[PDB]
Every structure is written in C-alpha cells, then in structure tokens.
What we know:
- The protein folds into three domains: 304 residues, Glycosidases (TIM Barrel), CATH 3.20.20.80; 107 residues, Immunoglobulin-like, CATH 2.60.40; 204 residues, Glycosidases (TIM Barrel), CATH 3.20.20.
- Helix content is 28%, strand content 23%.
- β21 and β22 form a beta hairpin.
- The site of a molecule of 2 linked components (NAG-NAG) has 13 residues, from loops.
- One of its GO terms (biological process) is carbohydrate metabolic process.
Amino acid sequence: VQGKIVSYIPAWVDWAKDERGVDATKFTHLYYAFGRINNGKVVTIKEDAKWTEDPTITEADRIKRRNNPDESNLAYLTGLKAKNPNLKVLVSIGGWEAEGFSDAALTPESREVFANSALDFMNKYNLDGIDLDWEYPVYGAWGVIKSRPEDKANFTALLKLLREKLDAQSTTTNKYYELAIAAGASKTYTDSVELTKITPYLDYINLMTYDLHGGWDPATSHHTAVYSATNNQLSVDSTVKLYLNNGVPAEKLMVGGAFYSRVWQNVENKGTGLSEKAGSQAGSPGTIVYSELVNNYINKNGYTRYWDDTAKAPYLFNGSTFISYEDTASAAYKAEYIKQNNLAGFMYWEYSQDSDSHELANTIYSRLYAKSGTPLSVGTSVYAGTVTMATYTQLPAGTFILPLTQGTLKPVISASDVTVSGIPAGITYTVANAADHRNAVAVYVNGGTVASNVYDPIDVRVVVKASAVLEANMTDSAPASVTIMPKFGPILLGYVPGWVDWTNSAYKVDATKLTHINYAFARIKDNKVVKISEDINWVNEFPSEEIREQRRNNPDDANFAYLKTLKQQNPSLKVLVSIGGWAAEGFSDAALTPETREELANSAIAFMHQYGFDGIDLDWEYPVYGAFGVIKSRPEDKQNFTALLKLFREKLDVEGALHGKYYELAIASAAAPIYINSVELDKIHQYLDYMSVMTYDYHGSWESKTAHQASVYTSALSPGDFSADSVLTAYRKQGVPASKLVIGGAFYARGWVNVPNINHGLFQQAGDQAKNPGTPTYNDLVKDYFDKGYTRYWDNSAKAPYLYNPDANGGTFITYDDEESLKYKAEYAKNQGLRGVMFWDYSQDISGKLLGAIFNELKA
Ligand SMILES: CC(=O)N[C@@H]1[C@@H](O)[C@H](O[C@@H]2O[C@H](CO)[C@@H](O)[C@H](O)[C@H]2NC(C)=O)[C@@H](CO)O[C@H]1O
C-alpha cells in the first residue's frame, strides 16, 4: 500500500456495538474525532461542557453524550490492527467549535500542561500519534471561538513542543510518532499560520478542502470540488496551488474530501440550480450525510443528479433545493489528482457518514491503489436479472437493472454507451439510467412475440462502454449476464441419497415441489460406471462387517423403481444420476486419453438408460488438486475435464436424437478459488445445462475461528469472506452465464466447540476442537439443539442464522441454513437470473420445512 488514506472517525458512535463495524483494510490511518481541551488539558469528549450541552435534543441524547464510550471506542479501533497490521490510530484534538486552543497555547507555561496531557492521552489508549484540529487560530472562525493575534506564533510553538515530546519518547520506544494538523483551505488560514516554520515539525498537512462554499454564500456552488470551473469558486486545485506557492511541499499535503453535502434552499428554479441565487437558509438542515443522499436524494424523490464536468463534482437539484456532494466519480478525480501531483494522500471526514456498504471509502482505496496508466474496467453487479416468458412465445415487458460497482454513469447515458447481446429477434429494447438508483443501467425490454418457442433460458449480455461513464481512462465492462427465463421458471433440485431405502422409509420425496432430483451416487470402477455397492472404496470405508453388509446390499434397484413411480406420477420431473461425489476415485485416469474418455461416456450412457435416468451429473471432487490428495489429480485434468464434458454432451446429444427426448448434463462445482483456477469455467458451460455450485462448506472445524458456513451474503463483520453472492459473482466474472448457475442450500450444519462468550458467538477465536459436532443435520438440530439449551441469533448483513450455547463444551457455535436463509438464497436466484436452486440433501429434513421455504419463494 503506497500513498496514504486518512479516515476521521467520530467519537460519538458506539463502534463496539455498531452493526457494520469497520473495514480497516481500506485506509492507512484513522483519526479519532475528537479529544477536547478542559482546564488547559487534553480530554475525552464526554468531558466537554460545550458539546455535552447542545440544545438540539437535550433529553435522551444529552445522557448518551455524558456517558459517551470513548474507552470502548478506542479499544475497538486499535483492536482493528488484527485485520490491518500497518494501520495507524491517531487522536485528533479540537474540531469545529472546540474551544480553548487559544488559552492552552498562549504562554510557554500552559503549552506544557497541554502537550504533556496530549502525550498522556496518546500513551493511555495506545495510539500512533496526535492531530491538532484548531478551527481556526487568530480569526477563530470569525467569532465561533476565542482568539487573539498571538495565536500565529503560539500555534508554531505548541507544535514544535509536541514534536519534541514525541521524538523524546520515540528514542526510548523505537516507535516514530506522527503529528498532523488539519489546515484551513482559505487564504485567510494560510495568513494566520507560519507555514515555512510549521511544515518541518509535521508529517502531513490535512487540507480541509470542503465547506468551501455553502448556504452562507448568496449563490450555489460546489463545496468539495476538484477543479475551479469559475474564478470565484474555490477547489482542491486552488487550495493545493495556494499551499505549494507558500513552500509547503507536495509530499506532505493530504487532499480532503467529504461524506456529506452542503445544501441551499430557496434556489431560483433556473438552469441546473448551479451558480443561482439563493434566498433564505433559515429552514435549512445545512448538511445531509452521504448515506441519507443514497437512501432518499440521488435520482430519487424528484431530485435530478447533475455533473459539472469542469469542476468534476456532482450536485442535485429539484427546482428549489440544491445539494453539492462528493460521489464515486468526484472521489475518483481526487485520487487521480493526488497521483498526478505527487501528494501524500486522500483524507476524508467522516467514516460514519458513508453508505451502509461503505461505497466512498471503498471507492477511494480502489482508485488510490490502482497502478497508473493501466486502465481500470467498468464494473457491473445485478439488481434485477430476470424477465420470464409468459408462454412459449409471448415475452412480457420487463426491465433488467445493473448497478455499477466501479465507475459512474453520466446522469443521462445515450444508446451508444450500452450494447445488448442476445435479446431474441423481433423484440425492441431501449437502454437508460434506472429511476430511483444513483448509478445503474436499465435495459427496458418491450413486450413481444419471439420467432420460435422458448424452452431454455436465453443469456442476455449487457456491455457498459467507457463512453457511458464519467471517469477518465476507463475500459469497457466485461459483458454482464442476465436472463430471459422460460415460462416454467426456476429449477429446484434435490440431491437424493441412494443409501436410504426410500421404498420403506416413512419419509418420501416430494416430486410436486422438485423439478429435479440427482440420485447420489453412481461410481467409477475399472473405467466403468457402476452402482455404489460395487465401488470397493465405499463398500470398504469401514472394516466393521454389519456396516459393510448394508453397504453391499444397497437398495439401488428398489430406489430406481421408486423413482420411476415418482416420474410416472409427475411427468415433468427430471431425475439424473450423479456419478461420483466425495472420495470418488476414477475420474483423472478416465479423463486422460480419447480412448479412456470414450469408455466412461459409453458406460455412463448405458448406466443411465438401464435404471431410468433423464441425464447425467458429474461430481468430480476435485480436479487438478484432488481435494488436497483424497483423489488422484493431475495438472492435465483441467483441459481433460473439459474434453470429458464435451464428449458426454456429444454422446448425450446422440442419445437424445435416438430416443426422441432431451438428456441433461450437469456438474456440481465448488466455491473455493482453487476450483475456479483448476477448471476452465469459461469453456465447459456451453456443454452444460447448469452448474450445481456448492455454496456451502465455507468454514469448518479445520479452522479455529467461527464464521458462516453458507451465508447468502458476505457479512459486514468479515469483509472478503465467502458468500453465495461473492462466489456466484466470482463464477460470472469467469464468463459463466447466470442462467447456467444454481445456488446451493445445505440441510446440515457445522460448528466449533470452545467459543468465548463474545458477540453472541460470532467471528471469535476458537478453542480446542476435539468433540466438535462435525455435521449435525437439521433433523439433529430439531431433536437435540433448537430449544435444548441453544439460542438462535441472526446476522442481517449476511442473512445467515446461527446457534450459540455458552454452557456446552466452550460453549459451541453452530452455523447452518434454515427457512429464512434458504428464502433469501431463493430471492437471490430470482433477482440475479440464476437457473434455480439446489440442495444437499433430501434425507436431512424429514419435516419438509427447508424444502417448503425454497418452494414457497422460488415458485409461489
Ligand atoms: C477535520 C475536519 O474536517 N474538521 C472539522 C469538523 O469538525 C467538521 O465536522 C463537524 O464536527 C463537529 C464537531 O466539531 C460536529 O458537530 C458536526 O456535526 C460536524 N459536521 C459534519 C457535517 O459532519 C467538518 C465539516 O464541517 O469540517 C471541519 O470544520
């Protein structure tokens, strides 16, 4: 990590007890806002008179202010060195309207008591440095604070001293300490401080290049723009130029940006509202934070979004309220300026004001640790990914929607900026910006009649061109995958295990809710597909003979007949054979040569015809890496798997053209990045009906830290971590159409014994893992857990349930899929244009609720 990122964080949130925590891997420094001065000395904000007594809400809030948890905050924040080692946490002193800088600084005497107490503060909370935010010396923000002309010098002296105290301490500790200032943007500020004396005492000067204009001005303008587009409009550029002219070296200047807007009301309804006269601001809230703009203002509630292309700043206007803000784009242009002009880094006030998802802080990081002159591509995610055929030929009016993940659409895109591949001919389509979204394309797909019958999903491909976007040197987007579904809708597929005698089980299979069954499994033996009772590895997994017998007399013939009655009873039901699965030997050998591939194909085709199947699922676990030596693997598996699949599909096309029927070919495929490496995902998919992605087994007893085994989304408390969302995005990134992906639900759990009672059990360091529960099924969970000690919590940013019991071996943490999570996996599949939903496995919920909740969302 090269240039710096400073993220001020407010003292007046509970960060320990916040739901989103802090992704401290996206900034370098973290200034804590603020400590204050009291009787000439640095202190916690909860000990500040003037801030504990704000009359805006003096009831429930003043209490919270006097008992403000800074101790907890500081401990939680420096604790984030866990996730980032490099991180620095400084204490920032002052802020807007913070009093007593002029008295504490005034005389050599009082400076001591302040600079001393400032170290006491730094030491006490184990902090990497001090930041003085005096606003402002000499002129006191024109009467907001106490001030006198002698500040000019005293500021200098105070700063010199602090540097002495912080180098003194360094020579014993071996840790260099940092000293910063936030510094005013105006010519007036530079005139009130001794810059060519001050610079050398400091590591960085935080230019506050915001609040450059606001409701105090008679006309609108940008408050935190990059460039000056008119003579009178201040900017990062004007301010940086002002500071270089006074000798301050580029290498120490941090450019500032803002996660909030400056607002004007009663603006003349002329032009765009930019540079228009403005009346009374007596009604005005003054600012609106970035999260609130996202939620209700940007392209919402009659507020049009605009861009000043010379200033490189966004603004909104509705005919009378104007709002000037920092967005994804303006941050891009500011990062670029830092790099263009060799500045120290990007500073921002402040972190809490970012969106739920941290859109700005993440944008800055991404832009600042891009390598220059090596263009970034436009990013896409999906919000609405499916339109569904009414009949075999009638397509209704529908609308796909794609938010940008990287880059920022012009407020009005032209057709040349988006190209749509794979709308079937006959059917007119339009592109545009999606209403009620800040930054998203809309392909409006008009009703129509398609030329021929639509039996299979159609992959629609959307390309977001560089000309669409506002940023500078950017390349076209990877062609994004959305889906026109056939009239029958998503598939819902159960893995049905062959080691249950379903003929005699009181618990039966629900062929009315499933579209698809995968009988698990067939196997490989001497390069032949055979029943599971022939595979010696399996039969002889355990020595004990009363198992081994059950294994040899596995009720395959029965179950195949049983499945035949399901098929007769429900004639659209498709039942397929899964060759392989965990510990299944034979695949690598079988894929080697054009002779060995031919053998297995023919033998698989013949197994399929003999016991009544509608297609094949291949379940190779796993190629090239062989699940880390469970399975003979080879580098050459990669291109072989792909010839195996190409072959199977050709044999199955032969079969189908002989039996007057369509045979399916499918694989199961893992989530791990090594799988995605080890397989030619871009190449194999054209041969498949879909991929049953195993969006589960993310974390187990093989780690000693708790985490979500099957989360539909990546929790906020574990950035980076596995989710269905992350994994299926990763799949599509490789080129796999959405309409050939299937999301996996798991009907069993995992867990860890010896989890400390912290945060309901969640993301904790684990203990000794002997007597770990292994994999209890939901059945097990119903009898022996749910009410029997344990308590069910829910992480809403992940949408994944979890159990903790303090009084059981540590206690224990359980991670699983349930009704609510399976619902969301199913919503995700409809929203994203996925082929369908899948699970493992039918025998693990005899109650039928997990299936019910997939079915109730996916189909009704
Ligand atoms: C580094 C920096 O920008 N410092 C100043 C900030 O304090 C100021 O933010 C304001 O801080 C006050 C505490 O001093 C808060 O009461 C107030 O709510 C907060 N304002 C906002 C919009 O979050 C910022 C922004 O005006 O500018 C500096 O002056």
